[PDB]
Write a protein that binds this ligand. Structure first.
Ligand SMILES: CC(C)CCC[C@@H](C)[C@H]1CC[C@H]2[C@@H]3CC=C4C[C@@H](OC(=O)CCC(=O)O)CC[C@]4(C)[C@H]3CC[C@]12C
Ligand code: NA
Ligand code: NA
Lengths: 106, 66, 103, 466, 100, 47
């Protein structure tokens, strides 16, 4: 399981990176809607990141849920691609060398 | 209230089943050749793009003897 | 003894004769290979062989479309020599209508 | 093998067919006797001229003798001089079977392609009225002459091409379900023209690789009008394109004129700092910058860091700027969307109303069409539409990130995981559709229970969803 | 399960009657396919009272029904008298609009 | 009759003569093996 692990560990390292990219996007679309609209400093370069972590419809609420269907697709797909990144890719020899390389590092 | 939770058992079945069928739809279906062509078709779609950078898009028989 | 090899010969032959439109002269009686032959010509007039039969009393084979009932194996020789001489202006075997005698 | 061997003996011993050797050939051609004809007729102690062999060859094709067409060719027969135009039209008008010809019309209509329009034109004007050897090969591959089309293929001028083009003509007729047996034999015949063109290319690739890749992009003098590589991708010949010859050619194409042995990061450390190309830090193969910025690795690498820097000035104009006037920071945000639109009208070319059938090029096109509505909502000067113009800018900031996320989603898992992905992506597209169908059901069973029971307008057609 | 050996030999004998009926049908299907499918729905004069196809589904003969002869017959049956070479959407664009 | 074996002999021979730089004396006429020979020497003066 040392080839299943540490190939999967980078795959979730990639997925949470695509989550944090989306949280910066969802932060701007939250900062650009609510108040302190033009009340700006270098406050805004640091508030937009942490604000989603702690958390008029004339026709615009129906693509917003279409965004809430498109956004939850491309993150859930990257979650399950991270779930089976170990699957693709003589499987007996490849783990014994990776078992050898870690212990010989230690 | 007792069939309502039976609805809350039948509804959470048929959505969770479709979730896990979506989890393993890739599994069914020579697996080496089929990804290299799909790797080829995507890059050749991108090689079919113009090979100029983004801001400049507005600017734009004896070998057979061998 | 219609062996599984001996029925391979006399059933590939019927399809070959179907592809050429031949005649098959045989003993017109309800026994032996001659009974097995007539079953294949009955089953292959649906897909152009004409099986002409020449013959206690033997039961007659009820699968020969034209029957020609010692004193009868002399018109068989008289028949084939009239066929083998018979020049035809299609002329692929130099005319002269190719004859085979399976024994 | 026993009747014809017996019939030949009574013919040969007539002592008059020494001059009439032509009778013995048509006898051995009416049957299938290759080994007897090659030993007793074509054995060079008899005097023949190999010019009266032409009326025998024409019967050796239409009577389905695939072994005698090889015999007459290896005994000397100029096939490019035998194939006259009146001979070729005796094939398509008389000896072309009507079942396969009626199979061709249904093959041409429901699956229309540039190759099939060339062939359907070719059968038509041959049944109406040059490269002729490339027309006899079409005649024997349409009717699935499986052993005979292997013989005519061996005479063709360029055979890395014609094995792939026949593999397309079969596979485009192997989908017609009028006769699944004939559509099944055309499928297994096209797989051994794929295999016939794989090893013919790897032998061409085990030699000089630059000499092989010129053949991949040959003009072919309009055989099908396509090259050998483009004929393979349209026919989905997975065995030909997945070989290490062609996959090396793409990786040499995608890196372009840059060598693939520099490093991966060594190009990226030259995109930021332009003086590092002029050194020996890149090892490509006088003005190397035109070779640098035209290879599609750096083109794709530019359109990510520009697209990332597009969003950081789309976010900056949405927080500090955007007060009441479309200022200088927004006018560049106007025209860059138009730059990101003016390529989509060229993506509106070469689409055929089917490049919008991936469900992600449309989300990029509905992104720009959602952006022009924000421009329309902008220059109206009222506070009810100014704030309504800010909101459909902010919802479009998500979509211009979901394009960037879909770039990173594809470009990392582009490999063996590209069949796991994009088959799974439709599967979650289906699941959330069944979720949204259930949420409409759970909305009605919530609206039909709580108050405003009979308090109805077109309010109810839009409140039950959200 | 009274004698698992006799129940085991009957299992491996039935697999080579499945296989004996697969290639006897594909040879009947390599020829005229309309001639083959009439044999699938034969009345049999009450041998078991069933046809050749219904005798296979009740016996769960997976090798006989998964062959490309019978699976073509179902897809020609499920599309019915409509040909399968129209399109998929071409029928659906005729359900809405009856003159098409 | 240029058999597929008889063309294996007189095409391996041309490559052997290419590796040594030989001459090939033959009947200079447009028939038979002599026509098939000349096609291989035409195609092997490029290597
Ligand atoms: C410092 C921040 C603001 C900028 C970060 C830069 C990245 C966004 C850029 C520079 C390096 C780029 C990558 C350089 C190497 C490639 C390999 C390439 O993989 C392939 O082999 C393509 C398939 C093929 O044709 O062979 C896919 C894109 C990718 C990851 C590029 C994607 C985008 C990257 C990560
Ligand atoms: Na989410
Ligand atoms: Na639920």
């Amino acid at each position: 399981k040392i080839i299943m692990l540490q190939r999967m560990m980078i795959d979730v390292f990639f997925f949470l990176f695509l989550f944090a990219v989306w949280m910066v996007a969802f932060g701007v679309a939250r900062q650009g809607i609510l108040r302190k609209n033009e009340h700006r400093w270098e406050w805004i370069f640091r508030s937009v990141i942490y604000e989603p972590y702690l958390a008029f419809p004339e026709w615009i609420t129906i693509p917003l849920v279409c965004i809430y269907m498109l956004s939850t697709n491309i993150l859930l797909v990257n979650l399950l691609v991270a779930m089976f990144g170990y699957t693709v890719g003589n499987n007996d020899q490849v783990w014994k060398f990776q078992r050898f390389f870690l212990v010989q590092e230690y | 209230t007792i069939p309502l939770v039976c609805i809350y058992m039948l509804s959470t079945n048929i959505l969770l089943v479709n979730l896990l069928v979506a989890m393993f739809g890739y599994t069914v279906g020579n697996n080496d050749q089929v990804w290299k062509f799909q790797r080829f078709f995507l890059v050749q779609e991108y090689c079919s793009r113009l090979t100029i950078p983004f801001p400049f898009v507005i600017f734009a028989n004896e070998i057979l003897a061998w | 003894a219609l062996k599984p090899r001996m029925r391979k010969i006399f059933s590939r032959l019927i399809y070959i004769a179907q592809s050429k439109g031949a005649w098959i002269f045989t003993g017109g009686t309800h026994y032996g290979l001659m009974k097995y032959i007539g079953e294949v010509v009955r089953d292959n007039t649906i897909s152009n062989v004409v099986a002409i039969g020449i013959a206690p009393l033997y039961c007659l084979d009820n699968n020969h479309t034209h029957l020609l009932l010692t004193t009868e194996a002399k018109v068989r020789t008289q028949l084939e020599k009239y066929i083998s001489e018979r020049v035809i202006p299609e002329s692929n075997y130099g005319g002269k209508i190719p004859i085979v005698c399976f024994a | 093998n026993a009747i014809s061997f017996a019939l030949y003996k009574a013919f040969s011993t007539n002592e008059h067919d020494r001059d009439n050797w032509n009778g013995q050939l048509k006898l051995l051609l009416e049957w299938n006797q290759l080994d007897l004809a090659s030993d007793e007729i074509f054995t060079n102690d008899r005097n023949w001229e190999s010019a009266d062999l032409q009326d025998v060859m024409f019967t050796a094709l239409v009577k389905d003798r695939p072994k005698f067409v090889r015999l007459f060719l290896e005994n000397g027969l100029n096939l490019r001089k035998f194939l006259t135009t009146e001979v070729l039209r005796e094939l398509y008008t008389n000896n072309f079977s009507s079942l396969v010809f009626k199979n061709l019309q249904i093959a041409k209509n429901s699956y229309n392609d540039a190759l099939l329009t060339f062939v359907w034109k070719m059968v038509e004007d041959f049944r109406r009225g040059r490269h002729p050897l490339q027309a006899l090969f079409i005649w024997s591959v349409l009717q699935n002459k499986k052993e005979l089309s292997k013989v005519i293929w061996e005479q063709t001028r360029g055979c890395t091409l014609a094995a792939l083009g026949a593999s397309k003509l079969l596979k485009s007729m192997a989908k017609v379900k009028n006769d699944i047996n004939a559509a099944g034999e055309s499928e297994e015949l096209a797989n051994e023209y794929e295999t016939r063109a794989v090893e013919l290319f790897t032998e061409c690739y085990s030699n000089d690789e630059d000499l092989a890749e010129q053949l991949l992009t040959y003009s072919c003098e309009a055989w099908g009008g396509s090259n050998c590589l483009e004929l393979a991708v349209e026919a989905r010949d997975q065995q030909f394109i997945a070989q290490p010859g062609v996959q090396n050619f793409l990786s040499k194409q995608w890196y372009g004129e840059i060598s693939r042995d520099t490093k991966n990061w060594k190009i990226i450390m030259c995109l930021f700092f332009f003086p590092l190309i002029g050194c020996g830090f890149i090892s490509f193969r006088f003005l190397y910058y035109v070779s640098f910025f035209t290879s599609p690795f750096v083109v794709f690498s530019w359109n990510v860091i520009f697209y990332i820097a597009f969003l950081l000035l789309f976010a900056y104009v949405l927080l500090m700027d955007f007060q009441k006037e479309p200022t200088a920071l927004e006018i560049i945000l106007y025209v860059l969307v138009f730059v990101l639109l003016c390529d989509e009208v060229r993506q509106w070319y070469m689409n055929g109303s089917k490049y919008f059938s991936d469900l992600w090029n449309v989300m990029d096109t509905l992104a720009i069409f959602y952006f022009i509505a924000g421009i329309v909502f902008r220059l109206h000067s009222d506070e009810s539409s100014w704030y309504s113009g800010r909101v459909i800018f902010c919802l479009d900031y998500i979509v211009f990130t979901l394009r960037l996320i879909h770039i990173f989603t594809v470009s990392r898992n582009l490999g063996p995981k590209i069949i796991m992905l994009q088959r799974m992506m439709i599967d979650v597209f289906f699941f959330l559709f069944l979720f949204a169908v259930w949420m409409v059901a759970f909305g009605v069973a919530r609206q039909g229970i709580l108050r405003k029971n009979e308090h109805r307008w077109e309010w109810i057609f839009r409140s039950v969803i959200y």
